[PDB]
Every structure is written in structure tokens, then in C-alpha cells.
Design an enzyme around this catalytic site. Structure first.
Site, PDB file in Angstrom:
ATOM      1  N   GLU A 243       0.829  -1.198   0.000  1.00  0.00           N
ATOM      2  CA  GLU A 243       0.000   0.000   0.000  1.00  0.00           C
ATOM      3  C   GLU A 243       0.871   1.259   0.000  1.00  0.00           C
ATOM      4  O   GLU A 243       0.506   2.269  -0.610  1.00  0.00           O
ATOM      5  CB  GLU A 243      -0.939   0.004   1.209  1.00  0.00           C
ATOM      6  N   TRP A 246       1.606   1.966  -3.334  1.00  0.00           N
ATOM      7  CA  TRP A 246       0.529   2.587  -4.097  1.00  0.00           C
ATOM      8  C   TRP A 246       0.654   4.108  -4.007  1.00  0.00           C
ATOM      9  O   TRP A 246       0.276   4.824  -4.938  1.00  0.00           O
ATOM     10  CB  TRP A 246      -0.842   2.143  -3.591  1.00  0.00           C
ATOM     11  N   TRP A 274     -20.693  13.495 -18.805  1.00  0.00           N
ATOM     12  CA  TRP A 274     -20.790  13.879 -17.400  1.00  0.00           C
ATOM     13  C   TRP A 274     -21.929  14.879 -17.226  1.00  0.00           C
ATOM     14  O   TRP A 274     -21.867  16.006 -17.721  1.00  0.00           O
ATOM     15  CB  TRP A 274     -19.466  14.489 -16.919  1.00  0.00           C
ATOM     16  N   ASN A 309     -10.123   3.531   3.410  1.00  0.00           N
ATOM     17  CA  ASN A 309      -9.946   3.344   1.983  1.00  0.00           C
ATOM     18  C   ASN A 309     -11.188   2.759   1.313  1.00  0.00           C
ATOM     19  O   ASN A 309     -11.558   3.159   0.202  1.00  0.00           O
ATOM     20  CB  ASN A 309      -8.754   2.427   1.719  1.00  0.00           C
ATOM     21  N   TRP A 327     -16.087  14.032 -12.504  1.00  0.00           N
ATOM     22  CA  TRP A 327     -15.022  13.716 -11.555  1.00  0.00           C
ATOM     23  C   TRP A 327     -14.145  14.890 -11.111  1.00  0.00           C
ATOM     24  O   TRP A 327     -13.803  14.986  -9.932  1.00  0.00           O
ATOM     25  CB  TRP A 327     -14.127  12.593 -12.106  1.00  0.00           C
ATOM     26  N   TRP A 350      -9.360   8.591  -7.471  1.00  0.00           N
ATOM     27  CA  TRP A 350     -10.585   8.870  -8.204  1.00  0.00           C
ATOM     28  C   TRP A 350     -10.580   8.224  -9.580  1.00  0.00           C
ATOM     29  O   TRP A 350     -11.587   7.661  -9.999  1.00  0.00           O
ATOM     30  CB  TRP A 350     -10.822  10.380  -8.337  1.00  0.00           C
TER      31      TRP A 350
HETATM   32  C1  LIG Z   1     -11.070   8.029  -4.092  1.00  0.00           C
HETATM   33  C2  LIG Z   1      -9.831   7.968  -3.200  1.00  0.00           C
HETATM   34  C3  LIG Z   1      -9.163   9.118  -2.818  1.00  0.00           C
HETATM   35  C4  LIG Z   1      -8.050   9.019  -2.004  1.00  0.00           C
HETATM   36  N1  LIG Z   1      -7.414  10.190  -1.640  1.00  0.00           N
HETATM   37  C5  LIG Z   1      -6.309  10.086  -0.802  1.00  0.00           C
HETATM   38  C6  LIG Z   1      -5.702  11.350  -0.455  1.00  0.00           C
HETATM   39  O1  LIG Z   1      -6.023  12.462  -0.869  1.00  0.00           O
HETATM   40  N2  LIG Z   1      -4.611  11.228   0.418  1.00  0.00           N
HETATM   41  C7  LIG Z   1      -4.095  10.034   0.943  1.00  0.00           C
HETATM   42  O2  LIG Z   1      -3.150   9.990   1.721  1.00  0.00           O
HETATM   43  N3  LIG Z   1      -4.747   8.890   0.519  1.00  0.00           N
HETATM   44  C8  LIG Z   1      -5.840   8.827  -0.333  1.00  0.00           C
HETATM   45  N4  LIG Z   1      -6.460   7.655  -0.706  1.00  0.00           N
HETATM   46  C9  LIG Z   1      -5.796   6.485  -0.482  1.00  0.00           C
HETATM   47  C10 LIG Z   1      -6.264   5.887   0.850  1.00  0.00           C
HETATM   48  O3  LIG Z   1      -7.663   5.719   0.917  1.00  0.00           O
HETATM   49  C11 LIG Z   1      -5.519   6.229   2.142  1.00  0.00           C
HETATM   50  O4  LIG Z   1      -4.129   6.519   2.036  1.00  0.00           O
HETATM   51  C12 LIG Z   1      -5.923   5.432   3.388  1.00  0.00           C
HETATM   52  O5  LIG Z   1      -7.338   5.335   3.593  1.00  0.00           O
HETATM   53  C13 LIG Z   1      -5.200   5.886   4.628  1.00  0.00           C
HETATM   54  O6  LIG Z   1      -5.598   5.140   5.789  1.00  0.00           O
HETATM   55  P1  LIG Z   1      -4.410   4.460   6.603  1.00  0.00           P
HETATM   56  O7  LIG Z   1      -3.365   5.487   6.851  1.00  0.00           O
HETATM   57  O8  LIG Z   1      -4.955   3.746   7.763  1.00  0.00           O
HETATM   58  O9  LIG Z   1      -3.911   3.410   5.502  1.00  0.00           O
HETATM   59  P2  LIG Z   1      -3.128   2.000   5.705  1.00  0.00           P
HETATM   60  O10 LIG Z   1      -3.998   0.906   5.236  1.00  0.00           O
HETATM   61  O11 LIG Z   1      -2.537   1.911   7.053  1.00  0.00           O
HETATM   62  O12 LIG Z   1      -1.990   2.176   4.607  1.00  0.00           O
HETATM   63  C14 LIG Z   1      -0.729   2.774   4.971  1.00  0.00           C
HETATM   64  C15 LIG Z   1      -0.325   3.860   3.983  1.00  0.00           C
HETATM   65  O13 LIG Z   1      -0.278   3.372   2.619  1.00  0.00           O
HETATM   66  C16 LIG Z   1      -0.771   4.421   1.746  1.00  0.00           C
HETATM   67  N5  LIG Z   1      -1.963   3.911   1.017  1.00  0.00           N
HETATM   68  C17 LIG Z   1      -2.939   3.011   1.434  1.00  0.00           C
HETATM   69  N6  LIG Z   1      -3.852   2.777   0.540  1.00  0.00           N
HETATM   70  C18 LIG Z   1      -3.478   3.558  -0.540  1.00  0.00           C
HETATM   71  C19 LIG Z   1      -4.038   3.761  -1.822  1.00  0.00           C
HETATM   72  N7  LIG Z   1      -5.151   3.143  -2.220  1.00  0.00           N
HETATM   73  N8  LIG Z   1      -3.407   4.624  -2.678  1.00  0.00           N
HETATM   74  C20 LIG Z   1      -2.283   5.249  -2.281  1.00  0.00           C
HETATM   75  N9  LIG Z   1      -1.663   5.135  -1.099  1.00  0.00           N
HETATM   76  C21 LIG Z   1      -2.322   4.262  -0.266  1.00  0.00           C
HETATM   77  C22 LIG Z   1      -1.122   5.621   2.643  1.00  0.00           C
HETATM   78  O14 LIG Z   1      -0.028   6.532   2.748  1.00  0.00           O
HETATM   79  C23 LIG Z   1      -1.360   4.970   3.982  1.00  0.00           C
HETATM   80  O15 LIG Z   1      -1.235   5.844   5.110  1.00  0.00           O
HETATM   81  C24 LIG Z   1      -7.590   7.762  -1.560  1.00  0.00           C
HETATM   82  C25 LIG Z   1      -8.263   6.613  -1.955  1.00  0.00           C
HETATM   83  C26 LIG Z   1      -9.364   6.700  -2.759  1.00  0.00           C
HETATM   84  C27 LIG Z   1     -10.096   5.423  -3.185  1.00  0.00           C
END
Ligand SMILES: Cc1cc2nc3c(=O)[nH]c(=O)nc-3n(C[C@H](O)[C@H](O)[C@H](O)COP(=O)(O)OP(=O)(O)OC[C@H]3O[C@@H](n4cnc5c(N)ncnc54)[C@H](O)[C@@H]3O)c2cc1C
Length: 415
Positions: A243, A246, A274, A309, A327, A350
Site C-alpha cells: 500500500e 501505491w 458527465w 480506503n 469527476w 478517483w
Molecule cells: C477516491 C480515493 C481518494 C483518495 N485520496 C487520498 C488522499 O487524498 N490522500 C491520501 O493519503 N490517501 C488517499 N487515498 C488512499 C487511501 O484511501 C488512504 O491513504 C488510506 O485510507 C489511509 O488510511 P491508513 O493510513 O490507515 O492506511 P493504511 O492501510 O494503514 O496504509 C498505509 C499507507 O499506505 C498508503 N496507502 C494506502 N492505501 C493507498 C491507496 N489506495 N493509494 C495510495 N496510497 C495508499 C497511505 O499513505 C497509507 O497511510 C484515496 C483513496 C481513494 C479510493
């Protein structure tokens, strides 16, 4: 003469290349510039930033060092700080964003002394030669995290200047600063990491680290996080690090495909019908669509500035595929409500959840607002917290006909 360490989206002392590079050459003074280009946003995000800047200063003070905070345009304030301190050079971490590049070029122009930019810590650099649009091939390049750089034990004395404004976030903020971030990382790794792969999909997101707000501002280095996680090893760590990748993939994408901020990665969507209906936009924005899941997500987002997420991909796709809301507008509004709002990451999220081309994700995939909520929220505890009004994840007067909405989209997409 001292060396200036200019902090931007890296409000921390641990694993900071620019800080150590300067310290190794002589005494340093830290600097943060409150840039209008970044601060002219929503109160919650502005406060989150300012409070983490206040914490960095405390961290400097605790070690006997000095952090200057100035307000204004970087190309005027950085040279000003350099002149006043008679600094020999300025050190910072490289930024590959459109604004970052413009800003640093402007600063270099006004600076009479050298501006040394060092690579920021990443698992995988965003400016890699090859440009991948799919995650798997990109992730294969990763061979484990490099060791993180240590924080200084103490800092040389220097003069301190500038005041740090206090803004009303309008909501409860997490504990700011690096210490809080590090304590949070240790807690997650010891307690939740083991089951992460099995709990990372809960709608309440309690199976995750909740560290995104810190990563977003560089209060926590992704390299340090990956290094610690990998020291634990196991399926959990492999998945959690995936992640983190990602996040790097998001920067990689925006760097190689700048235009995706303007249009979908997948060309066969550049001209999607849209339907911009102000009435529907508000329903979604305020979480008044009548759909239990979405309404719950948007309500938590407005109240906390955080969303798991799973919730984000649901609330996001709903707006794009069901309501057909454009979007671009939805993504900007979404980002402004997130404490971890990160342009590149939000845009990938997105375009991914909206079947717009990221990771060649298939458009035909459409989340089921009710099933989703039942499969990722047991005793409906989450729904009962953000939308008590709903007895279940059953549509109670939807702003649209879910079934028809689905058919509608699939039809449009198919062509
Ligand atoms: C529509 C959408 C918009 C999003 N916008 C953002 C945003 O503006 N900022 C942001 O930080 N994250 C965004 N995310 C990604 C994501 O949802 C989060 O990083 C996550 O929910 C953070 O929770 P956590 O720290 O407990 O994640 P954990 O599950 O603990 O993951 C650890 C770290 O991995 C990274 N990560 C995890 N999932 C993703 C992912 N899908 N894409 C990229 N990095 C990821 C984050 O830095 C996160 O803190 C978005 C996801 C979606 C679907």
C-alpha cells in the site's frame, strides 16, 4: 556562516537527507515558509499544516536548535532569511510537482547562494525512466527498503525568528508532530500489522494505521515506515508495504502523465457524458443521497476529515458511475475535506475507483452500496455511528434508482 535547511512537505527530523547533508558541513538553522499557494485552502487543512509546523519547532527547541518561520512568497522569503543569517547555502528535498518545480526555479533565481536539492526518501522514485500505467510491473522493481537516516541527537544553537499563526480547524485534529507519528507507527506494527491483510477492508478502517495525515505532510518518512514493517516481516508487512507503494505509484503516475490531472488516463473516456446537476452534487457532497453507505462516508468525512480506503472508493465511485457527476469537481471537493488530501494520491484514487484508466481497472466493476456495507461492516456498527437514521444499508428514498443508475452507466461505458 550557517547553512539553511528549508523544510517543505517534510516536517520531521528523522530520515531527512537535506538536514543531515547540511549538518555534516556545519551549523544549521531550519526554515519553513508559510506559502499562500499552499495555505489558501480549507481551515482544517491549514490548521493541520500549521500545527505540524509548530511541532517541528518544538522538536528543534527540544534539541537546542532554531527553526525560523516566515510568511510570504518563497522567492522573497528564502533569500531574505539567507541574507539575514548570512547563510552559505540552502538545502532542501527535491520536489517534482508542477508547483514545486516552478517555485524552486524562482527561488534559485533570487538566491545569491547555492540551493542544494536532495532526493526525498521514497520506496520507488517517481521520476523513474520507464512509465508504467499498471501497478504490478511497477511494484516488481521494489527490492526492499533502504535503511532510514538517523535524526540528530542535538542541534547547534542559532537565533530563532517568526511566529506561527493559530487557526481554528473547526474539528478535532489528530496529535500533531513526529513523536505522535512514531508512537502511532509502533502501535500499528506491534498490534495491527499481523492481521492487516484480513482487516484492511473494514468500512470503519480500524484495521489500518491511520497514518496518512502524517505521510501527507512528510511528518513520517515512507522509507522509515517500510523499513520497520519489513523488520517484522510476514504476510501483514508484505501487504501493508504494498500500500505504501501505491502512494509512490500515485506520484509516479502524475509525474509521467501530467495530463491526467486534466483528463482520464484512458482516452476512451475523454468525452464521457458527465451530467453536471448542481442538485445532485450537493446531495452527494452533503451525504444526502439516501444511500446508507455513501451518506455515512460523506458525513464522517465532513466531521473528521478522515475516511477508510473502502469508504472512499465507495463514496467516490458512487458519484462517478451512479450519479454521473463530473469527476474533476468531485475530486477537488473531496481533497479539500481530507486532512491527508494529496493531489496526486487523490487523483489516482478517483481515476481508479471511477474506472478512468488507473491500473487499467475495469469499468464494468460496480460496487453494490448495500452488499458492500454488509460485507464490510458486521453489526452495522459503522453505519449506526454516522447515519443512525438508517435501519440498514437498504436504500431509503435514493436520489436515483440504483438499478437503473447501474444499467445507465454500463450502457454509456459499453459504447
Ligand atoms: C477516491 C480515493 C481518494 C483518495 N485520496 C487520498 C488522499 O487524498 N490522500 C491520501 O493519503 N490517501 C488517499 N487515498 C488512499 C487511501 O484511501 C488512504 O491513504 C488510506 O485510507 C489511509 O488510511 P491508513 O493510513 O490507515 O492506511 P493504511 O492501510 O494503514 O496504509 C498505509 C499507507 O499506505 C498508503 N496507502 C494506502 N492505501 C493507498 C491507496 N489506495 N493509494 C495510495 N496510497 C495508499 C497511505 O499513505 C497509507 O497511510 C484515496 C483513496 C481513494 C479510493
Amino acid at each position: 556562516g550557517p547553512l539553511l535547511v528549508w523544510h517543505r512537505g517534510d516536517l520531521r527530523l528523522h530520515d531527512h537527507p537535506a538536514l543531515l547533508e547540511a549538518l555534516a558541513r556545519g551549523p544549521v538553522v531550519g526554515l519553513v515558509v508559510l506559502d499562500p499557494n499552499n495555505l489558501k485552502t480549507t481551515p482544517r487543512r491549514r490548521a493541520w499544516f500549521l500545527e505540524n509546523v509548530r511541532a517541528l519547532r518544538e522538536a528543534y527547541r527540544a534539541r537546542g536548535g532554531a527553526l525560523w518561520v516566515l510568511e510570504g512568497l518563497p522567492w522573497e522569503k528564502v533569500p531574505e532569511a539567507a541574507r539575514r543569517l548570512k547563510a552559505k547555502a540552502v538545502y532542501a528535498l527535491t520536489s517534482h510537482t508542477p508547483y514545486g518545480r516552478y517555485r524552486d526555479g524562482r527561488v534559485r533565481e533570487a538566491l545569491p547562494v547555492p540551493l542544494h536539492l536532495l532526493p526525498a526518501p521514497h520506496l520507488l522514485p517517481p521520476d523513474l525512466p520507464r512509465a508504467y500505467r499498471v501497478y504490478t510491473p511497477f511494484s516488481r522493481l521494489y527490492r526492499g527498503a533502504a535503511p532510514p537516516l538517523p535524526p540528530p541527537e542535538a542541534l547547534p544553537k542559532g537565533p530563532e525568528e517568526g511566529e506561527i499563526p493559530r487557526e481554528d480547524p473547526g474539528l478535532p485534529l489528530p496529535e500533531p508532530g513526529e513523536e505522535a507519528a512514531l508512537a502511532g507507527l509502533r502501535a500499528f506494527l506491534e498490534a495491527k500489522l499481523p492481521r492487516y491483510a484480513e482487516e484492511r477492508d473494514r468500512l470503519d478502517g480500524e484495521g489500518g494505521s491511520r497514518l496518512s495525515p502524517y505521510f501527507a505532510l512528510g511528518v513520517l518518512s515512507p522509507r522509515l515506515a517500510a523499513w520497520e514493517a519489513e523488520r517484522r516481516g510476514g504476510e501483514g508487512a508484505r501487504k501493508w508495504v504494498a500500500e505504501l507503494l501505491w502512494r509512490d505509484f500515485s506520484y509516479h503516475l502524475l509525474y509521467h502523465f501530467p495530463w491526467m490531472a486534466e483528463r482520464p488516463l484512458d482516452p476512451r473516456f475523454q468525452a464521457f457524458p458527465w451530467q453536471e446537476d448542481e442538485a445532485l452534487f450537493q446531495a452527494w457532497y452533503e451525504g444526502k443521497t439516501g444511500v446508507p453507505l455513501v451518506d455515512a462516508a460523506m458525513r464522517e468525512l465532513h466531521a473528521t476529515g478522515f475516511l477508510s480506503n473502502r469508504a472512499r472508493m465507495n463514496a467516490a465511485q458512487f458519484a462517478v458511475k451512479h450519479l454521473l457527476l463530473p469527476w474533476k469537481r468531485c475530486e477537488e471537493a473531496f481533497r479539500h475535506l481530507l486532512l491527508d488530501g494529496d493531489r496526486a494520491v487523490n487523483l489516482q484514487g478517483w481515476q481508479w475507483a471511477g474506472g478512468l484508466g488507473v491500473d487499467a481497472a475495469p469499468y464494468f466493476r460496480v460496487f453494490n452500496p448495500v452488499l458492500q456495507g454488509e460485507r464490510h461492516d458486521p453489526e452495522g456498527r459503522w453505519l449506526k455511528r454516522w447515519a443512525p437514521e438508517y435501519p440498514s444499508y437498504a436504500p431509503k428514498d435514493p436520489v436515483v434508482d440504483l438499478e437503473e443508475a447501474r444499467r445507465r452507466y454500463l450502457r454509456l461505458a459499453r459504447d
